[PDB]
Amino acid sequence: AKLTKRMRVIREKVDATKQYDINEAIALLKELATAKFVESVDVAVNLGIDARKSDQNVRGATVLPHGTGRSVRVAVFTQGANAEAAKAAGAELVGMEDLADQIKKGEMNFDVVIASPDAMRVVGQLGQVLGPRGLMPNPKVGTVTPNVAEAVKNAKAGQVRYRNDKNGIIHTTIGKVDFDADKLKENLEALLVALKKAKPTQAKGVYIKKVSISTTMGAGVAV
Amino acid sequence: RKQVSDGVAHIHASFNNTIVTITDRQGNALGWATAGGSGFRGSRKSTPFAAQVAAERCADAVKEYGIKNLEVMVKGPGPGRESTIRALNAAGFRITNITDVTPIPHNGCRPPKKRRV
Amino acid sequence: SRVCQVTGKRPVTGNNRSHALNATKRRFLPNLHSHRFWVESEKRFVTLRVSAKGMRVIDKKGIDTVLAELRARGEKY
Amino acid sequence: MQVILLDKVANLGSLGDQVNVKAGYARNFLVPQGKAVPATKKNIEFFEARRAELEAKLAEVLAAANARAEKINALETVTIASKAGDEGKLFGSIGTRDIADAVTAAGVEVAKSEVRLPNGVLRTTGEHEVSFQVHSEVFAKVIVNVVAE
RNA sequence: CGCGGGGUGGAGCAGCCUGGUAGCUCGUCGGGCUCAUAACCCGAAGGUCGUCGGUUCAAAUCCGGCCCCCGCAACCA
RNA sequence: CCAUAGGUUAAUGAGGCGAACCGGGGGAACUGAAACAUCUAAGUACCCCGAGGAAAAGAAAUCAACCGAGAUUCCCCCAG
RNA sequence: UUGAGCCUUGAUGUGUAGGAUAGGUGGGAGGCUUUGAAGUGUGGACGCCAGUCUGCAUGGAGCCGACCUUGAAAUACCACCCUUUAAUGUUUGAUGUUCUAACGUUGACCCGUAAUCCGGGUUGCGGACAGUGUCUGGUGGGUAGUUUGACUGGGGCGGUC
Secondary structure, rough: OOOOOOHHHHOOOOOOOOOHHHHHHHHHHHOOOOOOOEEEEEEOOOOHHHOOOOOOOEEEEEOOOOOOOOOEEEEEEEHHHHHHHHHHOOOOOOOOOOOHHHHOOOOOOEEEEOOOOOHHHHOOOOHHHOOOOOOOOHHHHOEEEOOHHHHHHHOOEOOOOOOOOOOOOOOEEEEEEEOOHHHHHHHHHHHHHHHOOOOOOOOOOOOOOEEEOOHHHHHHHHO | OOOOOOEOOOEOOOOOOOOEEEEOOOEEEEEEEEHHHHHHHHHHHHHHHOOOOOHHHHHHHHOOOEEEEEEEEEEOOOOOOHHHHHHHHHHOOOOEEEEOOOOOOOOOOOOOOOOOO | HHHHHHEEEOOEEEEEEOOOOOEEEEEEEOOOEEEEEEEEEEEEOEEEEEEEOOOHHHHHHHHHHHHOOOOOOOOOO | OOEEEOEOOOOOOEEEEEEEOOOHHHOOOOOOOOOEEEEOOOOOOHHHHHHHHHHHHOOOOOOOOOOOOHHHHHOOOOOOOOOOOOEEOOOOOOOOOOOOOOOOOOOOOOOOOOOOOOOOOOOOOOOEEEEEEOOOOOEEEEEEOOOOO
């Protein structure tokens, strides 16, 4: 955190030699947030991979079952009248050759994509621009599904992203500094599962190590 | 690291060496130069040919202190006792005072009587 | 004898021993000091002889649960 | 050193939890004053109950409340002075009533001198500043009197 | 009795113990400074580095005898 | 000062003795190792303290082995 | 007051051509600086002479994005990672500072006591010293236990084993 007039007045509550109990650190996490609105927290997954080898490089995301807060804007690839009940369930946009003219330009006016198998025959023209944006739906992930209206409602829980370039550990946002530490543990469990499904082939030796959360002048504590 | 621009300097010239110091009024030596620093043997070290090439080697010894105004003190009989001062003036420095402080013999212990030939 | 009057610690039999094959006697002697305590039942100070491990007990337990029950018949203290 | 508090002390105390203190400070103050102990969390209720009878009996020899701690902030000055030796030195300590008194009322030596020193009475005849002793919770200084006028 | 070493220009002492390999000072025979000699300076002349076989790219050097020596010890009953 | 060290008076306990055994303390060398230090010899020898009719031990934060034991001491054995 | 280690934090970061010193890197429109940005250099380090920091001349709530256009990649706002290096912090040795309370008196005094010890009190002067202990690097024939080759019509050197 940056040293500022509104930050000095909380920096005076902590000592550079002192660590806190796990249950006191989850309050220090909110004390250290100087904004009048509740700030967000980023978490590190403890790994397990070579920091620069590409056959150990990780990139992906996973969609949460219930989420930690803010919703995502959802687009649905389907045909005919099947889209209207999906607009009622949680879609903001419909996948059409009219909208594909924006998608081929790299411009995604949406945050998550769900596809119906007979409309996936259109998405297979655009997979090369959806790919490098994490948006490409896939049957092994269950984002290719006929029940698209229920699946866009399932997407409003939001998603967590993970990737590296130069570090062996991966850092990512997971929610507000005021989120329940017992429910944080549950979403981190779902993240660690998706990270084992996203395990690269050459990930030799140790992989998933113990996970913690860190504060300034309090040190990391177990989740 | 700002320049001080004012201070003192001390000159010593014996029959065997010229030794020049840029000093502080508290009695500190800030930088020094010796005429034996030019590699010259014996009483060569007391001539202007040696003492005149110690002055800018002494101004180099205070290159981070920064000098401009100097009050000079001079001792000893050695011929180099003023060429080292003019060479320092010619280095772009300005002499606030010159004073001679060469000792007058008092007690003197034992002299050569009995002097080497 | 260097007795810890507050616990009954005495010297003990024992050998020095080192990395040598020859073994020789030691007999462990205590370090021996004095300490002064207040007895709230007799409203006076008393001075007792104290030692390592023994002086660690009395400060931990408390004098009202050690010195206040230490007399076996009186011991003239 | 970790200790638990048995009485309300303005500088330190945690309810049902040990607090950090120096053992030397504790062994000169908080322990002999009955105000703290190392651990014994399981047994301090029986100790507190064993003091209840003792303080109920102590009220038979002294139950009085102090009235002097409320008065200290007037910074009231000494009216007694020592009679000085020809050389400008004093005879030192001999009795707690020929010193730091402001009311001349006592007929015998007092148990609590009006000022706190590690060694009683200073032999210097000059003006010096001493800490006024009422109770170990209210603090003041005063200069010594050398004139009595 | 031996033990360990040595075997060198004339004399006295280096080198050796790492074969690519005979040296310095005093001397001897002359040059330079000299009137002249010494010092100093520059030049020359010289040793079968014992003896016969062996081993080798080769032997003052290693290997076996013979042969002359130095030093240490040549009294214990 | 009060007090208490100190002083005095009354009472109890101990004191010395008695054969051998017995808990604790101090603690060898010889001997064997066909040689010696570790190891053996030995907690012996001798000395000291202290005490009972016996001393000492005990019914488990012990011992086993999935079977179970259920105090300790003494004896034959386990076992060369 | 500072030797040493360690935490903490800032400046970094460019070439080439163009506005433009994009360090890396993962997100990204309303969020942020008051112990702070400007000036742009006098002068100190570094230097692509621009710029930033030490600290001023000095002020003092902003600001920034569109159009324009570079590039794998962007220039508010917010994580994560770092070289070099100092100060604040911190652990831990020095140097010296005052002052009693572990400790001490082969100081003095009163009383036990017509007692050089001891005990109690009194009053001075020392001392975070000494004395001592757990563990331990080293020393130590002063003291003590022990080991310490053979053949040879003699021994020793030599030879033999």
